[PDB]
Design a protein around this ligand. Structure first.
Ligand SMILES: [K+]
Ligand SMILES: [K+]
Ligand SMILES: [K+]
Ligand SMILES: [Mg+2]
Ligand SMILES: [Mg+2]
Ligand SMILES: [Mg+2]
Ligand SMILES: [Mg+2]
Ligand SMILES: [Mg+2]
Ligand SMILES: [Mg+2]
Ligand SMILES: [Mg+2]
Ligand SMILES: [Mg+2]
Ligand SMILES: [Mg+2]
Ligand SMILES: [Mg+2]
Ligand SMILES: [Mg+2]
Ligand SMILES: [Zn+2]
Lengths: 140, 183, 140, 55, 71, 119, 103
RNA sequence: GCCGUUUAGGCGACGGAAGUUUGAGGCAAUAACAGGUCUGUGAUGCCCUUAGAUGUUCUGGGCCGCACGCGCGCUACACUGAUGUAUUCAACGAGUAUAUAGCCUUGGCCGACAGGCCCGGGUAAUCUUGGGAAAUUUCAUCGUGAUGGGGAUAGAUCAUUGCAAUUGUUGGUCUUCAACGAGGAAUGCCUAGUAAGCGCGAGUCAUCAGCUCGCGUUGACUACGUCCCUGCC
């Protein structure tokens, strides 16, 4: 089929994450934390990127448009029900949290509950289950 | 030549070499010629009725394993068709003859019960041949890019020649050997 | 040859021919949420075929041709399937009603299918003619 | 006001609202067909109610 | 640990266009095992060789695609 | 500077109740939409007395209650409530980060298990 | 005569219901009234399955109780007078006769 | 027909819907067990308690608590597959007080979903429901990579049931993406429409089915024996 390209990159340094060039671009974007298969699919469609390509096949500009979509799903018309941070506590702004910011938001959301002595925050602090599951026989 | 397997393969020119294994492979008699390896037959009410069941169907039924493939006989028939086409491609012969040769060159003839070495009956011989053939094909296909139809074709082709590159023939050899060591 | 109606042709080929017919006709207006939505909630990815809207339009057009009175809930049941519930047993689930309603309204804005007083949707004479005249072009 | 705090919890639903019509126990209650009998009481009166065991 | 490639290099394209048409049975699995290529690349290479007319088709199916040589 | 959806604490205090529902999560929104019962309002009517009759910039006198399923409002950021956990009233000074949560989430109804003998 | 009469018969027993139906269709055929019936509806099988043990000990054994409701429909064309004159014979216990006048 | 004392019966064969008392149940002796149940019973003897109650009711909590051990299960470990199209076959059963409306819900509209709104049908072979079940089938993608296998855990958020959802009722959306690559010693069930796979219905039920009791769909392997083990006689 398609033979190759001299520009084919095996590892592409993307959003402080390594993306395999031997992977289809849609599933290749799921390497960055905060981006799943469905959000990567939406990002690929809205950036006008061929879904039958491989990550290494794309050029610099194509990944730049992918990052334009990933860092601002809203300007590219990605609805607000499609975001992993809907209606933020402090901000109130809808946004798509990606990369290390996901871990940062996790830690801040847990610290908020660990200062107000909320039950769920204390469950997090004790290393036990937080979503009301039985702990007698499972989770060992 | 009115009845052909898949309406693509003739029954008349199938030679079942072994006289011992002749009444327990249902290929030669015109009563055992079928268009499809699918009959929904009641070949289990009596002790020796599965012998009068077409041999391609007996090969097909052993593909419905394991539990994740249980009851999926249309997919098994599809595997049989795609295997019989690869056999015809790689041997240029009638796939039914390759299959009967593989089932003949795979059934162990002697075994060790209790450790006295005993001889296998023709029915258990064909049962063991089919079980080893499909087991080897399935284990070849597991976690492998190669399709179950291609693995079945390769296993059947290597068992028809008699080569020790077929899991069934290697295993037949071990079985009969332990009945030579423990004679 | 010709003189073949819908119940004479292989459905897999008829749907493919009629989706192309609908896309050529240019009388279908696509929603904004064509590249976003999933056909059902048990689905985990949007349809992988760009012309899935026209394919589903042809499918429902053929279904209304063969049966009269199908409603939006009926079409949700028709295109619903098995939902995998993670560690829980699978069950049946229904499809999206917005997609079915929008496509059926688009097919009312072509005079292919109307709505019957008895409930649901009927095939129009023009729609019957269109499907039957496309069925004759389907190679046997 | 004691009458507004006596039986003041709603009995719209719940197992502690439906009782056996033969004994008033609230456990193992068969609500099917409007029987409203408990399992034990239905097993005893089933013949009178008209349920016959064939299989 | 499979190291199947996803895109041909020019030498492997030459071998695909010359040695592969000499294969008796041509299916995506055989090409993947021999040429050390991905199954997607195998299927697409089979389609291209069916476009250049260097192979025939004995049977096509969703699970198993069986192709053979015209020569 | 506590915010709760980009607003400020003073604005939140002054903000109308019908907007404050729309800043609250879906569970509090449904709770207010279905209408609060007389015990919930009565508790806030007692807490506002506790805040007003408070002598000076000291904490309002503890107001004990059995109300664990109560949505914490921005009106109650100065209150000192004691929620019954089944056995005793635990005193909590309500803080603004607690807005929208239930009072039950701030009064443990069990004891954190520290395991002993294998038995 | 003039109107259209649907007599619905239900019962828990087949023999009583069938002999009542035979009486009705025999009376209808003696007074020269055309009768469409008896028409046997699908039998309703009311089923209750419960643990036979009054407690939770032993092999969990289940008794399956069944009540079978048999429905019969008779369709005459006549006036109400002959209908209540026919459905006035001794209807056996358990049989629920129900007369409804149609157009 | 053969075997069988040529009996009682067995095997094979034709015919036959059926030849395995046709299949599967229900019922089911004598005598027992200090078997379970006083937490089914306005069945109960005796004992305890009985107004500051072991009665009753209301509020709140618990029955869910988690270093760990065991049992029944569900989901998997993948290509005989996952995903996304196309496509089209069941059966058992269940369903309302009409009050604006209660149960099963059709149809139309809004909504990405979740759900909501609006006209109605059905006390039912009449309406929901010809029950528009899945596995399966078809095409395409993936390509042996814990990988598009797996989906545990977790964050944010939106809806619904309810008087009330926190110790997440549940259902959605986006995100997070653990063990697990077939399981040691052991041990369970099963001989034909059976095992296994697949889904549906009912009971429980305001809401909650990974459970039970039924149902159908797809549909095998192996044996037609023995007392080796286990138990019973
Ligand atoms: K008792
Ligand atoms: K007692
Ligand atoms: K009871
Ligand atoms: Mg394989
Ligand atoms: Mg509706
Ligand atoms: Mg499953
Ligand atoms: Mg005892
Ligand atoms: Mg418990
Ligand atoms: Mg599929
Ligand atoms: Mg993974
Ligand atoms: Mg998955
Ligand atoms: Mg519960
Ligand atoms: Mg239920
Ligand atoms: Mg045992
Ligand atoms: Zn009772």
């Amino acid at each position: 089929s398609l033979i190759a390209g001299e520009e084919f990159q095996h590892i592409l340094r993307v959003l402080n994450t390594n993306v395999d060039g031997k992977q289809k671009i849609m599933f290749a974007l799921t390497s960055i934390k905060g981006v799943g298969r469905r959000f990567s699919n939406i990002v690929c469609k809205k950036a006008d990127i061929d879904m039958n390509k491989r990550a290494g096949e794309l050029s610099a500009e194509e990944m730049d448009r992918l990052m334009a979509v990933v860092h601002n799903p809203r300007q590219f018309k990605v609805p607000d029900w499609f975001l992993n941070r809907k209606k933020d506590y402090k901000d109130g702004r809808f946004s798509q949290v990606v990369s290390n910011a996901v871990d940062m938001k996790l830690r801040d959301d847990l610290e908020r509950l660990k200062k107000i002595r909320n039950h769920r925050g204390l469950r997090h602090y004790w290393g036990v289950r937080v979503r009301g599951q039985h702990t007698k026989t499972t989770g060992r | 030549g009115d009845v052909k397997l898949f309406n693509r393969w003739t029954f008349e020119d199938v030679q079942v070499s072994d006289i011992s294994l002749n009444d327990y492979l249902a290929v030669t008699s015109m009563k055992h010629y079928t268009f499809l390896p699918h009959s929904a037959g009641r070949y289990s009410a009596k002790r020796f009725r599965k012998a009068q069941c077409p041999i391609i169907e007996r090969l097909t039924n052993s593909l419905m394993m394991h539990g994740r493939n249980n009851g999926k006989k249309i997919m098994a028939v599809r595997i049989i068709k795609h295997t019989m086409e690869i056999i015809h491609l790689l041997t240029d012969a009638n796939p039914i003859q390759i299959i009967v040769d593989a089932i003949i060159n795979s059934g162990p003839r002697e075994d060790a019960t209790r450790r006295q070495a005993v001889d296998i009956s023709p029915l258990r011989r064909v049962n063991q041949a089919i079980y080893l053939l499909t087991t080897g094909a399935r284990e070849s296909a597991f976690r492998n890019v190669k399709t179950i139809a291609e693995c079945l074709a390769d296993e059947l082709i290597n068992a028809a020649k008699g080569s020790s590159n077929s899991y069934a023939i290697k295993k037949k050899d071990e079985i009969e050997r332990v009945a030579k060591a423990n004679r | 040859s010709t003189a073949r109606t819908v119940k004479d042709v292989n459905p897999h080929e008829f749907v493919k021919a009629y989706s192309a017919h609908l896309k050529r006709s240019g009388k279908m207006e696509l929603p904004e949420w064509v590249d976003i939505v999933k056909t059902a909630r048990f689905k985990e990815l949007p349809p992988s075929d760009a012309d899935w809207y026209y394919i589903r339009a042809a499918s429902m057009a053929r279904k209304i041709y063969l049966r009269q009175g199908i409603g939006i809930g009926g079409f949700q049941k028709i295109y619903g399937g098995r939902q995998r519930n993670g560690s829980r047993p699978p069950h049946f689930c229904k499809s999206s009603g917005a997609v079915s309603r929008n496509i059926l309204q688009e097919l009312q804005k072509m005079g292919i299918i109307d709505v019957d007083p008895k409930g649901g949707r009927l095939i129009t004479s023009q729609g019957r003619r269109d499907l039957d005249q496309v069925a004759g072009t389907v190679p046997a | 006001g004691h009458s507004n705090v006596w039986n003041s919890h709603p009995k719209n639903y719940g197992a502690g609202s439906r009782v056996c019509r033969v004994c008033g126990n609230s456990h193992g209650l068969i609500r099917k067909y409007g029987l409203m009998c408990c399992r034990q009481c239905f097993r005893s009166d089933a013949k009178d109610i008209g349920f016959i065991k064939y299989r | 640990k499979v190291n199947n490639a996803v895109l041909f290099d020019q030498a492997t394209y030459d071998k695909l266009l010359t040695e592969v048409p000499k294969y008796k049975q041509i299916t995506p699995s055989v090409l993947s095992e021999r040429l050390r290529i991905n199954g997607s690349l195998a299927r697409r290479a089979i389609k291209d060789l069916m476009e250049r007319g260097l192979i025939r088709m004995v049977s096509i199916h969703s699970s198993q695609q069986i192709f053979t040589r015209a020569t | 500077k506590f915010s709760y959806r980009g607003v400020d604490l003073d604005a939140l205090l002054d903000m109308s109740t019908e907007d404050l529902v729309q800043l609250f999560p879906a569970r509090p929104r449904r709770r207010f939409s279905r209408g609060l019962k007389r015990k919930p309002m009565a508790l806030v009517k007692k807490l506002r007395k506790a805040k007003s009759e408070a002598p000076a910039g000291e904490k309002p006198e503890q107001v004990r209650t059995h109300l664990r399923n109560m949505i914490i409002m921005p009106e109650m950021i100065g209150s000192v409530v004691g929620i019954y956990n089944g056995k005793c009233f635990n005193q909590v000074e309500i803080k603004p980060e607690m807005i929208g949560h239930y009072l039950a989430e701030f009064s443990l109804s069990y004891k954190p298990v520290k395991h002993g003998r294998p038995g | 005569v003039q109107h259209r009469i649907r007599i619905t018969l239900s019962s828990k027993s087949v023999k009583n219901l069938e002999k009542v139906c035979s009486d009705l269709v025999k009376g209808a055929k003696e007074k020269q009234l055309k009768v469409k019936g008896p028409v046997r509806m699908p039998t309703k099988v009311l089923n209750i399955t419960t643990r036979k043990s009054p407690c939770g000990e032993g092999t969990n054994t289940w008794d399956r109780f069944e009540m079978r409701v048999h429905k019969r429909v008779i369709d005459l064309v006549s006036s109400p007078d002959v209908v209540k004159q026919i459905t006035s014979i001794t209807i056996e216990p358990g049989v629920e006769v129900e007369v409804t006048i149609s157009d």
